[PDB]
Amino acid sequence: PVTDHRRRRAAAVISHVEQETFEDENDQQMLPNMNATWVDQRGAWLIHIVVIVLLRLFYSLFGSTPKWTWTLTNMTYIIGFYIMFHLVKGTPFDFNGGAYDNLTMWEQINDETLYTPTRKFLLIVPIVLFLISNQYYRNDMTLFLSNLAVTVLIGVVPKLGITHRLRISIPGITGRA
Amino acid sequence: HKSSMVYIPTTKEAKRRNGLNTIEEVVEKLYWTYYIHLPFYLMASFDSFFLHVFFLTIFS
Amino acid sequence: YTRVPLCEPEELPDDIQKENEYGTLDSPGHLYQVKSRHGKPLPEPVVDTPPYYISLLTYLNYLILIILGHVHDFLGMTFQKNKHLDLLEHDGLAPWFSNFESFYVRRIKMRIDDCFSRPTTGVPGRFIRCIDRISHNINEYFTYSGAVYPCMNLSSYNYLGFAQSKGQCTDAALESVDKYSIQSGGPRAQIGTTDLHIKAEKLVARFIGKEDALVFSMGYGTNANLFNAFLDKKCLVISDELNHTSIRTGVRLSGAAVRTFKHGDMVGLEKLIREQIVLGQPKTNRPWKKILICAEGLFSMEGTLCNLPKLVELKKKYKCYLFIDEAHSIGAMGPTGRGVCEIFGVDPKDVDILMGTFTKSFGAAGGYIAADQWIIDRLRLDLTTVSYSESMPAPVLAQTISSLQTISGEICPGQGTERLQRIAFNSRYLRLALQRLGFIVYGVADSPVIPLLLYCPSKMPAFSRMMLQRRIAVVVVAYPATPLIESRVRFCMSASLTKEDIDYLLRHVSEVGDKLNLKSNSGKSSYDGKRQRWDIEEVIRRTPEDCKDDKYFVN
Ligand SMILES: C[C@@H]1CC[C@@]2(OC1)O[C@H]1C[C@H]3[C@@H]4CC=C5C[C@@H](OCCC(CO[C@H]6O[C@H](CO)[C@@H](O[C@H]7O[C@H](CO)[C@@H](O)[C@H](O)[C@H]7O)[C@H](O)[C@H]6O)CO[C@H]6O[C@H](CO)[C@@H](O[C@H]7O[C@H](CO)[C@@H](O)[C@H](O)[C@H]7O)[C@H](O)[C@H]6O)CC[C@]5(C)[C@H]4CC[C@]3(C)[C@H]1[C@@H]2C
Ligand SMILES: CCCCCCCCCCCCCCCCCCCCCCCCCCC(=O)N[C@@H](CO)[C@H](O)[C@H](O)CCCCCCCCCCCCCC
Numbered sequence: 001p002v003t004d005h006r007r008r009r010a011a012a013v014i015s016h017v018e019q020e021t022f023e024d025e026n027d028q029q030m031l032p033n034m035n036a037t038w039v040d041q042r043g044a045w046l047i048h049i050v051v052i053v054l055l056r057l058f059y060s061l062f063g064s065t066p067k068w069t070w071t072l073t074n075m076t077y078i079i080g081f082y083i084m085f086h087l088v089k090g091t092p093f094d095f096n097g098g099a100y101d102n103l104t105m106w107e108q109i110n111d112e113t114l115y116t117p118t119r120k121f122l123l124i125v126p127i128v129l130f131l132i133s134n135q136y137y138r139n140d141m142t143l144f145l146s147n148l149a150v151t152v153l154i155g156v157v158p159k160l161g162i163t164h165r166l167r168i169s170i171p172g173i174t175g176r177a
Numbered sequence: 178h179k180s181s182m183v184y185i186p187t188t189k190e191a192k193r194r195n196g197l198n199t200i201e202e203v204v205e206k207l208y209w210t211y212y213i214h215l216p217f218y219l220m221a222s223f224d225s226f227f228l229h230v231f232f233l234t235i236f237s
Numbered sequence: 238y239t240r241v242p243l244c245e246p247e248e249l250p251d252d253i254q255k256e257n258e259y260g261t262l263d264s265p266g267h268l269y270q271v272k273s274r275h276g277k278p279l280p281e282p283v284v285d286t287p288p289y290y291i292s293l294l295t296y297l298n299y300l301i302l303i304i305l306g307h308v309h310d311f312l313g314m315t316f317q318k319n320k321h322l323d324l325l326e327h328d329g330l331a332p333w334f335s336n337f338e339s340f341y342v343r344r345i346k347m348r349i350d351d352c353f354s355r356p357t358t359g360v361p362g363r364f365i366r367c368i369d370r371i372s373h374n375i376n377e378y379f380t381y382s383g384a385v386y387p388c389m390n391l392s393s394y395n396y397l398g399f400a401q402s403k404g405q406c407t408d409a410a411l412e413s414v415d416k417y418s419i420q421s422g423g424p425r426a427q428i429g430t431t432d433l434h435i436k437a438e439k440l441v442a443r444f445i446g447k448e449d450a451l452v453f454s455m456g457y458g459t460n461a462n463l464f465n466a467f468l469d470k471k472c473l474v475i476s477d478e479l480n481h482t483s484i485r486t487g488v489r490l491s492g493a494a495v496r497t498f499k500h501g502d503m504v505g506l507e508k509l510i511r512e513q514i515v516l517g518q519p520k521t522n523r524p525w526k527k528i529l530i531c532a533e534g535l536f537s538m539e540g541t542l543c544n545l546p547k548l549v550e551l552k553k554k555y556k557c558y559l560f561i562d563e564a565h566s567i568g569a570m571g572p573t574g575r576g577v578c579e580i581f582g583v584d585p586k587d588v589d590i591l592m593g594t595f596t597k598s599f600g601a602a603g604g605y606i607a608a609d610q611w612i613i614d615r616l617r618l619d620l621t622t623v624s625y626s627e628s629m630p631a632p633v634l635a636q637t638i639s640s641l642q643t644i645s646g647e648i649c650p651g652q653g654t655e656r657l658q659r660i661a662f663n664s665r666y667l668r669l670a671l672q673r674l675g676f677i678v679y680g681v682a683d684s685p686v687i688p689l690l691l692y693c694p695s696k697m698p699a700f701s702r703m704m705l706q707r708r709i710a711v712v713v714v715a716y717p718a719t720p721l722i723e724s725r726v727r728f729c730m731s732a733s734l735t736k737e738d739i740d741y742l743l744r745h746v747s748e749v750g751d752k753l754n755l756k757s758n759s760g761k762s763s764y765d766g767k768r769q770r771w772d773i774e775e776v777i778r779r780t781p782e783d784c785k786d787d788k789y790f791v792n
Contacts, residue, residue: 026519030495031485032478038721043292050293061232092340093717096489180256181249182364182387185707187744210753213298215695216348218375220305 007101009175017102017165018177028099035091035100036108039118048125052077067137074133074147078126078155086158102175106158107165114161126155238380242368244358251403257387258362258401260735267736268658269665269785271572271683273582279544282501282792285677287757291692292722298694299721306344310336341717350376352701352713358385360402363733365390365710388705389738391728392712396569396685397656398733399600399640405649406600406639413635421628429628437634444641445593446575446585447607451617454629456564456594457483458622459604464491466619468529473513475506476531479538481562484531494519503547510555528557534566534577537727538719539688540680545577549587560590568598569685574644574657599640601633656732660685662784663730667739669784670777672763674747675756675770679725682790687728696753697724703752707745740777747773764791 008018019025038044055076059069085106100108110116130151137143157163167174186192217223249257314321314336324332346353351372359366364387370379399406413433422428434452442450453459460483468474468491476484478497488495496513498506510528517523530552532543545561552559563576571579576593578585585591590608595601608616617623644653661683668687671678677690691697697713704711715724750756760768783789 022519026494027489027492030476030497034717041720042286042722043289043296046289047293047296061229090337092337094338178256178261179253180364181253182257182389183708184741187748189748190744206752207754210696210699211294211693213301213695215698216302216345217305218348 007175008177009173011169011173013169015167015169015174015176017167024099028096031095033091033095033100033108034093036105036110039109045118045121052129067140067143070133070136071143071147074129075150077129078150082154082158102177103165114164119159123156123159126151238382239378240381241356242381242383244366244368244383244385246359255403257364258360258403259398259733260363260738262655262659263735267662267781268655269662270658271570271580271661273572273579275582278546279542280792282541283761284679285759285761287677287692287759291757295693295722302345302694306340310340310344346715347376349698352698355710361390361393361395361400362398363390363731363738364388365393367710386708388708388710389742390710390731391742392710393729393731394597395600395729395731395733396598396660397644397653398731399598401600405643406636409635409639410632413631417631419630419632421630423628424624424626425628426624433631433634433638434629437638440638440641441605442607444575444645445591445605445607446578447591448610449613450605450607451613452629452634453604453606453622454627455602456596456604458626459592459594459606460484460487461490462487462621463606464488464493466616466621468493469526470494471518471526473525473528474531475509475513475528477533477543479536480531480533484562488531501541501544503544503551507551510551510557514555528555529560530557531560532562534561534563535570535684535686537565537686540684540686542577542580542681545581545583549583553587558589559587560592561588562592564592564594565597565686567593568644569657569660570683574653595633595637599637601637601640603629603633603637659732660730663732663734663739665784666736666780667728667730667743669789670739670743670780671746672758673769673771673776673780674743674750674773675758675768676750677758677762681792682787685730687730688725689728690723690725691755692722692724694724696755697726699753700726700749700755703749704745707749709742709745736781743777744773762791764789 052073055073056069059073062069086104089102089104091100109119130147134144134147137147167176214220214223314324318325324336326332356368356370357365358368366385367388368381369384369386370381372379393400401407417431417433425434438450438452441452442448460481464474464487468488470492472493474488474493474495476488476495476497477500479500496509498509513525513528518525530548532548535542543561548559551557561577566576568574570576573579575585576591577583578588590606590612592607593605595603595605606613606616639648643649646653664683664685664687668678668680668682668684671687671689679688679690680686691700691713694715697715701711701713711726711728713724713726719725756770758769760766763769
């Protein structure tokens with residue numbers, strides 16, 4: 001071939017996305033992303049509190065016990081955030097030629113900068129929510145263990161210095177480079 | 178200086194003049210425009226989800 | 238019925254058509270002359286913001302839209318396949334486009350598609366004629382009937398009112414057709430060139446102020462096929478993030494390294510220049526062969542000007558090069574119409590390459606490049622469009638030459654200055670009145686584009702549809718073209734409109750905005766630091782006299 005533009009799907013237990021070449025990196029990422037730029041804007045940090053409050057009020061309008069209400073709201077918030085950020089890979093609109101087809105929205109924030117204030121806030125919020133919520137179901141150990149497992153496994157491990165550009169082939173042969 | 182242009186009379190100005198509900202109309206506009214309804218199709222049943230007014234109407 | 242009808246032209250007397258195309262001035266008091274800034278730098282612009290609940294409502298609406306769209310897509314494409322035969326593999330062949338790459342157009346814009354792609358007819362002057370259509374299903378297909386109605390024009394690129402069928406330009410075009418046929422032989426290298434091309438090139442070079450100039454047939458091709466002539470993989474390009482797609486395509490085709498700096502931030506530009514000079518090429522740290530800076534004259538999306546003297550200072554002191562686009566600034570800005578150079582007083586020799594487009598202010602189609610002598614002589618041999626594409630036809634050349642001569646003053650005396658004064662006064666009056674009513678208006682004091690912000694997504698179709706019933710034509714833009722929070726309506730002013738039309742538009746817009754609750758001013762628009770919620774009659778009575786003073790504009 002005269003261009004050699006192909007996508008690899010190497011299979012291994014632990015694998016990482018290869019570093020971009022000169023043409024793909026220094027030239028095909030020049031314009032604003034329009035997908036991870038709205039994070040550092042007006043009213044982008046208070047909306048999470050509003051979502052949490054609305055979910056809590058909606059669940060309380062049913063008239064259930066505090067333990068079930070708080071467990072359900074924590075699980076729903078964490079699952080929704082995971083579905084929005086960590087699951088999907090790509091961009092809803094063509095960028096240049098498909099340059100961002102191997103990365104999630106979390107990796108694209110702030111041009112792949114590891115530590116920025118918004119990331120710190122996003123990591124801080126689930127811990128504070130868990131600390132506030134545990135006080136209602138301390139008696140039940142099963143629910144405490146379930147909440148701890150959900151928080152640690154979904155809302156903590158992905159947002160780490162490790163597990164950056166990390167892919168596992170157990171649920172499907174992932175594509176790297 | 179004459180041009181072949183038709184001028185639409187303005188409401189509240191030579192339309193309702195020569196030719197309680199205002200509060201209801203204003204409330205309806207405030208409820209509709211500030212919510213996401215126009216870019217929805219067939220989703221007029223989403224207003225049924227806003228039955229929380231009935232739930233909070235009953236006290237004690 | 239489904240197909241677009243062909244409309245037979247109407248029979249009207251000459252005076253009525255002339256009034257329809259170009260208005261007649263009522264009083265000589267509706268003109269303003271533009272001054273030149275000698276040594277006053279541009280202050281940092283100030284923007285205004287609405288309260289928080291607007292942003293929160295916008296975010297909630299977008300979240301609901303995205304969730305419902307994805308749920309509908311999944312359920313529909315899982316539970317049935319007969320209807321979605323254009324997004325699935327057939328006989329071992331992949332579909333034309335992909336599901337995920339066209340989510341927004343299919344799921345959000347399609348429901349308000351009726352606000353885009355509106356067919357018209359006739360000359361696009363003061364009043365534009367539109368064909369009536371009936372929406373079926375959800376903006377899927379339309380049915381047309383043989384009925385046309387006039388509408389006021391605020392959506393066309395006609396700044397000096399040169400889009401007329403009666404005048405010197407039309408006679409010149411007809412005479413050119415009589416002399417030269419509409420045939421173009423081929424590329425300018427082989428047979429295409431004639432004497433009229435040389436006349437136009439020399440006239441353009443004299444008008445702009447440089448030594449030599451070249452003409453082209455398309456504005457897009459001027460940028461898309463220029464940078465590969467003198468750039469390669471060992472050069473750096475610094476460009477503003479708000480740049481046209483043609484420049485990006487040209488740089489991509491060239492292959493040079495691209496780095497962008499934030500709009501209106503000179504300190505970051507200086508830091509980037511220093512870091513790139515020190516560091517050098519990637520993986521080798523060798524010095525760059527050359528550095529080029531790209532910028533635009535007037536940005537259409539916000540109506541703001543670029544700081545030219547600061548860029549000249551940086552390019553001189555760090556030994557860089559400069560490139561300036563003037564598609565929206567030529568023929569409409571400055572005391573005479575030369576461009577931003579007359580606004581700032583900067584000599585045109587400092588800028589290396591200048592560019593422009595005939596269509597926005599002269600009523601034709603084409604483009605030009607202006608530079609020194611040896612640069613032009615080398616680029617003529619090194620260019621691709623000259624010896625591979627077609628040539629510029631004769632009627633367009635005649636129209637452009639007539640318009641440029643009229644604006645310069647060689648023929649039809651006392652017309653160009655009057656048009657420039659009209660457009661300046663109209664823009665200033667509209668901007669000041671809109672700010673006094675209580676709205677949010679962006680841009681510099683004298684800019685033909687007036688952007689009005691409409692934040693909530695559901696408030697765009699309502700405004701566009703309500704304005705149509707009142708016979709006013711508007712253009713609205715939204716995400717992803719604009720940021721998520723900020724959606725706006727763009728106003729394009731002309732020299733053919735009259736103060737009565739402005740008053741009519743102001744009354745109707747004020748009433749519609751009061752109905753839709755679009756007034757959110759935080760007091761930073763007023764120069765005295767107070768909220769402005771006036772009446773329409775007071776604005777109409779007081780603004781025309783007080784608009785000439787420059788103390789009423791924050792920027
Ligand atoms: C409380 C209640 C509980 C219950 C519940 O609600 C809440 O719980 C909820 C749990 C929900 C799901 C949760 C999360 C997702 C994923 C999301 O994802 C983005 C949208 C789609 C695309 O995503 C891809 O976007 C990129 C482009 O595709 C991928 O890019 C690469 O691949 C490119 C490939 O060209 C290459 O260019 C490169 O290699 C590279 O670019 C990228 O990897 C990946 O992100 C999702 O996948 C698509 O997959 C197919 C297309 O691939 C579509 O067609 C298929 O449809 C049929 C089935 O197979 C067959 O008939 C067709 O033949 C067959 O083709 C299918 O319709 C569609 O789903 C779409 C929504 C969904 C499914 C939700 C639905 C609703 C629930 C089931 C709810 C549920 C109701
Ligand atoms: C009754 C009660 C149930 C309530 C359900 C809602 C649950 C709410 C709580 C969870 C949500 C997290 C809260 C924070 C979000 C605040 C609002 C921000 C809005 C931003 C919208 C603009 C973003 C544009 C960029 C587009 C983008 O991202 N593209 C892809 C990647 O490039 C992403 O893959 C994509 O978008 C996500 C896929 C769409 C939704 C997937 C799920 C399908 C619907 C099912 C919903 C399940 C419920 C949990 C979400």
